[PDB]
């Protein structure tokens, strides 16, 4: 407990590592730590804003060091003190967990300066919100085939080391070349059976698993949230945060208006996922053993 210990009221980039990588100091073509610009200023081309909220935003850059384009998240403001440090720095600390997996974005460096957390991950194509925002309609089944596989390879990924990703949705789903993507975004991602019970924060209303509603955690509710994730991009469907629709979503409920055109394939592998009761939830291991779901 952090907000107890004496850690309160205490100008160069400090890397952020959990899996240990000395040295912590940062260099690069095109920084002098002696002027006053930030490593972030110095070191990178800012080309674009991607995102922004609460949170910061989030940049495409192409590094001075190497050439290449990323995607840098920077925070909002500094740190309000040690917890909210020691939270912010967990999401380079889970994203290292996840480890390097194809279906997962690779985090490429993280450090700190000013009371500010950088994240630099590898540059991704467009997340299925955008993809789907930008097509205008639902997406053709073949495509979802592979959307669907690629992202339940990932939560396998995760899954079978104790990981909760929470908070999985269209837009933290990346697009790549033909036709495969990567999950990321692991800022509220939990090992369960990691203390504090609680510490836990909350995904997006609209894809949380029902079970979530009386705290109990594990990987199902993932499979639950990329369930609601496929059938809107597959449906062009609209999610409800709350009331009856939400409710409905959550007691096996497909609306025959937006899901008739499913196919029966894909309609029963929706079905599995979003079963109401965790325990008998498909696992995306066994989601993955379907002969449907085979490396196409
Ligand atoms: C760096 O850190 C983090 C970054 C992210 N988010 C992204 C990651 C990652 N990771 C990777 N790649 C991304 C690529 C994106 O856009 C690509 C296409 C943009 N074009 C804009 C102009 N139009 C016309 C065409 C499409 C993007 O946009 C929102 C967000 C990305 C998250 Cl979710 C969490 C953390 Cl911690």
Redesign the pocket.
């Known amino acids: 407990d952090l907000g107890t210990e004496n850690l309160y009221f205490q100008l160069q980039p400090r890397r952020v590592s959990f899996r240990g990588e000395a040295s912590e100091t940062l260099q690069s073509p095109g920084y002098d730590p002696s002027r006053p610009e930030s490593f972030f200023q110095q070191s990178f081309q800012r080309l674009?804003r991607?995102?922004h909220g609460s949170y910061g935003e989030?940049?495409?850059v192409r590094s001075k060091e190497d050439g290449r384009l990323?995607?840098?998240?920077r925070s909002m403001s500094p740190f309000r003190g040690p917890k909210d440090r020691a939270r912010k720095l967990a999401?380079v600390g889970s994203?290292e967990k996840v480890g390097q997996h194809p279906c997962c974005?690779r985090?490429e460096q993280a450090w700190e300066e000013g009371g500010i957390l950088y994240?630099?991950?590898?540059?991704?194509?467009?997340?299925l919100?955008?993809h789907c925002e930008?097509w205008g309609a639902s997406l053709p089944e073949a495509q979802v085939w592979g959307y669907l596989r690629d992202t339940l390879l990932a939560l396998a990924h995760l899954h079978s080391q104790g990981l909760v990703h929470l908070d999985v949705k269209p837009?933290?789903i990346?697009?790549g070349p033909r036709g495969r993507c990567?999950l990321?975004?692991?800022?509220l991602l939990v090992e369960l059976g990691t203390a504090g019970a609680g510490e836990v924060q909350e995904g997006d209303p609209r894809y949380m698993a029902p079970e979530l509603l009386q705290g109990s955690y594990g990987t199902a509710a993932d499979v639950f949230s990329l369930g609601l994730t496929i059938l809107e991009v597959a449906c062009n469907m609209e999610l409800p945060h709350g009331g009856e629709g939400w409710q409905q979503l959550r007691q096996g409920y497909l609306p025959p208006e937006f899901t008739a055109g499913l196919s029966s394939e894909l309609r029963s592998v929706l079905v599995m996922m979003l079963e109401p009761d965790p325990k008998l939830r498909a696992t995306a291991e066994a989601l993955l053993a379907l002969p449907v779901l085979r490396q196409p």
């Open positions: 674009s991607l995102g989030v940049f495409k990323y995607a840098v998240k999401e994203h974005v985090l994240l630099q991950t590898e540059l991704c194509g467009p997340s919100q955008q930008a837009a933290n990346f697009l990567k990321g975004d692991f800022g």
